[PDB]
Design a protein around this ligand. Structure first.
Ligand SMILES: OC[C@H]1CNC[C@@H](O[C@@H]2O[C@H](CO)[C@@H](O)[C@H](O)[C@H]2O)[C@@H]1O
Length: 276
């Protein structure tokens, strides 16, 4: 059955996890957290403990603001990577790790579309493989590797699979995507779940790996968010059959992505996610 996850809008302390479970009226199967590449596992541990004590899987989006793909492929981050691998192995529990993500966008300093042009398919693949190699050399077989694409290719040189590091280095593929509604002054428009996700899914469906929707959410403005939610989960279950997990992005950020941005959105979300 479809696993239900969330980034709960703050680092997932015990109380933040429990509070979200009360909010959505259901167990979180996956708890999502973002960290950077100057964060030791000792900082992560208490969060990890809360997640596993709850009976959930921890997915960590591991964001190398501190190293780009050239730095990483050349081994400049290896001391930090090695420590993380050793500490995660020692921890021993199943952790889903999503390094270097949305690399077919242009907003991250490790992304192929990033305006400095420093990141290429080759440097990206070499970087990703290097990370995995180090984890494997340190026995961290408990760490599952999540490859990721943004729903849209944004920026020069971007593609869904040009930076794909190979089935030998990947446990899950994943897609991120947002219905921005009419909230953005550049000219965003309301998009249904299908309109957001269908292109990326077609590309990833050609890969023999299960798929996670690692980040998704909808604005309130420019359409009916409650109906969007109902239809999104229906779409996932009906036509996105390789998708095994749906992980909401619950934060009032660029717009109000929260499941409780309105009472009607919340009601729809509670019903949509199901018993399981
Ligand atoms: O634009 C929509 C989202 C698209 N995906 C990444 C999100 O940013 C991430 O958001 C996280 C939670 O705010 C932060 O901890 C990370 O540093 C940051 O990279 C965006 O808000």
């Amino acid at each position: 059955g479809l696993k239900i996850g969330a980034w709960v809008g703050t680092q997932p302390s015990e109380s933040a996890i429990k509070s979200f479970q009360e909010l959505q009226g259901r167990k979180l199967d996956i708890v999502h957290q973002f960290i950077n590449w100057s964060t030791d596992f000792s900082w992560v541990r208490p969060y990890a403990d809360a997640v596993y004590n709850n009976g959930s899987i921890l997915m960590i989006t591991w964001e190398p603001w501190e190293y780009n793909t050239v730095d990483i492929k050349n081994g400049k981050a290896d001391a930090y990577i090695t420590r993380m691998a050793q500490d995660m192995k020692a921890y021993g529990k199943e952790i889903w790790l999503r390094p270097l993500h949305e690399a077919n966008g242009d907003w991250y300093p490790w992304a192929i579309g990033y305006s400095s042009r420093v990141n290429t398919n080759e440097t990206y693949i070499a970087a990703f493989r290097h990370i995995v190699d180090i984890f494997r050399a340190n026995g961290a077989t408990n760490v599952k590797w999540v490859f990721n694409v943004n729903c849209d290719n944004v920026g020069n040189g971007t593609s869904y699979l040009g930076h794909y590091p190979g089935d030998n280095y990947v446990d899950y593929t994943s897609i991120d995507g947002y219905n921005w509604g009419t909230t953005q002054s550049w000219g965003s428009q309301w998009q249904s779940f299908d309109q957001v996700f269908s292109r990326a899914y077609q590309a990833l469906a050609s890969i023999n790996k299960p798929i996670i929707i690692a980040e998704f959410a909808s604005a309130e403005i420019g359409g009916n968010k409650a109906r969007w939610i109902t239809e999104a989960y229906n779409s996932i279950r009906t036509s996105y059959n390789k998708v095994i997990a749906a992980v909401w992005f619950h934060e009032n950020k660029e717009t109000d992505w929260r499941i409780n941005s309105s009472p009607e959105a919340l009601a729809a979300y509670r019903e949509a996610i199901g018993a399981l």
